Every structure is written in C-alpha cells, then in structure tokens.
Design an enzyme around this catalytic site. Sequence first.
Site, PDB file in Angstrom:
ATOM      1  N   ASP A 170       0.942  -1.321  -0.134  1.00  0.00           N
ATOM      2  CA  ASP A 170       0.085  -0.212   0.281  1.00  0.00           C
ATOM      3  C   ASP A 170       1.099   1.042   0.308  1.00  0.00           C
ATOM      4  OD1 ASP A 170      -3.565  -0.863   0.814  1.00  0.00           O
ATOM      5  OD2 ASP A 170      -2.402   1.627   0.711  1.00  0.00           O
ATOM      6  N   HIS A 225      -3.516   5.536   3.158  1.00  0.00           N
ATOM      7  CA  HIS A 225      -4.714   4.868   3.291  1.00  0.00           C
ATOM      8  C   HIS A 225      -3.554   3.265   3.580  1.00  0.00           C
ATOM      9  CE1 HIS A 225      -6.321   1.779   0.844  1.00  0.00           C
ATOM     10  NE2 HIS A 225      -6.686   2.587  -0.235  1.00  0.00           N
ATOM     11  N   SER A 241     -10.765  -1.885  -0.066  1.00  0.00           N
ATOM     12  CA  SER A 241      -9.646  -1.611   0.904  1.00  0.00           C
ATOM     13  C   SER A 241      -9.501  -1.556   2.007  1.00  0.00           C
ATOM     14  CB  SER A 241      -9.043  -0.477   0.642  1.00  0.00           C
ATOM     15  OG  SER A 241      -8.589   0.288  -1.061  1.00  0.00           O
TER      16      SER A 241
END
EC number: 3.4.21.14
Length: 433
Positions: free
Chosen positions: A30, A68, A254
């Site tokens: 990520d 994220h 996600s």
Amino acid sequence: NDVARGIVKADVAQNNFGLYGQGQIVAVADTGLDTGRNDSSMHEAFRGKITALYALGRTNNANDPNGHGTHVAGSVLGNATNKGMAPQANLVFQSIMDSGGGLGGLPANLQTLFSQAYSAGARIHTNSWGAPVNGAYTTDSRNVDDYVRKNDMTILFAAGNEGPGSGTISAPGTAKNAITVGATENLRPSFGSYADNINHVAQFSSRGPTRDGRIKPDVMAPGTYILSARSSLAPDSSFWANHDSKYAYMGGTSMATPIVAGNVAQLREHFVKNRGVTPKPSLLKAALIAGAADVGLGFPNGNQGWGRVTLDKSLNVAFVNETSPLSTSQKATYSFTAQAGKPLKISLVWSDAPGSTTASLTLVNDLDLVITAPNGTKYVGNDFTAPYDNNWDGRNNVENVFINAPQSGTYTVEVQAYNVPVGPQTFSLAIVH
Ligand SMILES: [Ca+2]
Ligand SMILES: [Ca+2]
Ligand SMILES: [Ca+2]
C-alpha cells in the site's frame, strides 16, 4: 475494526481458539506506513513487529502522507488499540506510493513484489489497490496467478470501488488464484446507512462477474466506517470520519480486504498449529468460502460472491490440501456422512495455471465437483437451479455445492478432471457440516 472482528467472528478465533496469528507473517502493499521509520517513531499499532519495511516508490521514503496503507495495515495486525484481526502476526510492508500520489513503485512484473515479501518470511500478501478495468484479466492478473501456482503465498485483492454496477471488478482483482474481497457494511448505525445492516452489500463494492463470466469477488467483509490506525502524516480528507490522533474512519473494499487478510493469518495459524498441516492457498480460500455467510442475495451472485466471511466456521473444516493430483479423465473420490438438520457445504478450489489476457475464458485446467446424496440425487459444482446436475461449470476455479437440509447418510464427493491441459492439477476441498 473492534466491530468487524465480531462480524467475521475474528473474536471467537481469538477467545475460544487462542488465534491472534502468532507465527504468521502478513505482507501488505500500500501507500506507506505512518512515519516510514521502523524505530521508536512508528505508530504504536506496528512499533516492534515490522519484519521488513521497503520503500519501493520514493527513494529511502516509506512514509504515509496519504493515510491509506497505515489504515489498511492496522486492520491486518495492528496491536495497540482498535487492533487488526491478527494482532500477533508480523508485518512486511512494501511502500509503493510515489512522489505524486500514484502507485508507481509497483514493478512491471508483480512476481518481483511477491517474492520480495516471500523472502522476508511472508506467506500471505494483501493488496488494497487495483486498476478499474471492468473485469479484464490482465498481465498483472496473470503474474498473480503464475506466482500462486508456483509458491505457497496466499494473495488477496480488493474487488474495487466502482459498484454497484456489474462487471466492475478491478484488476488484479480479476486473477483466478487470488482471494478477492468486496465490502459489506460494518455495524455502526450512528453513521448510519452505509453501516446499519451487516447483510447489506456496500454501494461502491465492485460487482461481478469478470469479463469471462466468473464469480468475483470471492468473499465479503465489513469495510464501511472501519476504525483503524491513523497516520501521523495523513490529513482529515483521507478519512470518512475523525476519531483521535492515532485512529480514524475509512470505508472501501480496501478496508474489507485487510480484515480478510488478518482472518487468513488466523486461519493459517490454526492449520499449522492445531491441525498439523501448512495449508496451501487453495485450502485457505476454500475454507473461507465454505464457511462464508449468505447475506440473503443467494447464489451464485456477483454482488456478494460466496458470502461474508465467517471465521469460526472456516476453522474446523474437513479438508483435502492439494494431496490428490489429477490429469485429464482421472478422478478423486471421497465419502462424507451428513446429518440431517444442518447445512452441508462443499467448496472445491484450485490454483489454476495462468490464463491468457486475450482468450475468451481464463480457465485452463477444468475440474468438476460432483456430489451424490444417499438417495441418488446429484449436484454439480455451482448449479443452484433444480435439478442441480444439468449445468456444468467451465469458467470457474471455484466449484461449490451447498445444501440447506441434507439427508442423514453418506454423501459421495468426487472431483473430476474434465480437461487438464497444463497438468497434473492439485485441488483443495473444504467441507462444513
Ligand atoms: Ca445500509
Ligand atoms: Ca468445472
Ligand atoms: Ca441445473
């Protein structure tokens, strides 16, 4: 996360089985991981349990200004508060975000990324990212499939965020041998409609099938309003809602994906520690699927896939762990005695040779699951229209037979090698009764 743990039953694994995923190494790919230093400055969730931290996209920099990857990674194995599902696993992190906000540190050949992690000890690899290619099977999807068939890595991909329209699954989410995860709702009703029914598939969840008509995603998980680790460098705009300085809310396939990755570290620990076997990626996938929860849309179905993870059910499956190779026309035959009153679920999963980016169908090796009840009734894999034996599957490297109310008596479970061009092909089975 405290809520998703209870939904996918990561709590029962933890309290009644002692499974927090010690001994398992989960690699995440990520944006980056908080401060980007694997020393005292790292977010409490990850401090001291980073097996390796690789900066792939910006040189000597694996920090998270986005947010994220810290959040994702928290959901996997965070072990301060708002803990991930597998708080005792250790972390390999590959930071792929580049100097412009893109994922430019992914290598052209994705096998170079998974082998980097495999060599750091990792046996599970979770990827909350994709290209919104509406179901196409790409080179990346193909390198994913090659890697799994050759190596004991379970690889996960988010379905994507282009729902609720069908044919929206994103690559490399479209790969055969990956476990691909769409999002149900977490249960935080105060938020409220994106999180007030655990059986509700989320609007944005990309939906199946893929271009060649396969069922993706494979399974579901809470991934709306997920409280997880908040990056010291991420601003409020990367999140759904604030909470405090170390934790915050995001929603997405996600967020679902790393819950299921953590649940695999837990599922994998149980096989190795309590069952005397290292489960191949095919078994790990089969056990999730067999154990998973019909949200009420039924099967087959591109919106929920095979259902919403239910971990306690996946833990004590009867199994075959790729110990029966098959060349075209041969068959493996097993008997299972069912009790009337409980559902019987049989999932056949294989790691299929990789397909072509340009063929009509991606499937290469075609195995057929064939169940035979005490009284002579026959079910073939994925045939849910009565009678359940006239619609043979030739697209999917998953085959399922699920019976609400089975007979008391012995069922025969047979896997048939229909056409096994790149053989021999091993397979796994998971059975829940
Ligand atoms: Ca809802
Ligand atoms: Ca088949
Ligand atoms: Ca039929």
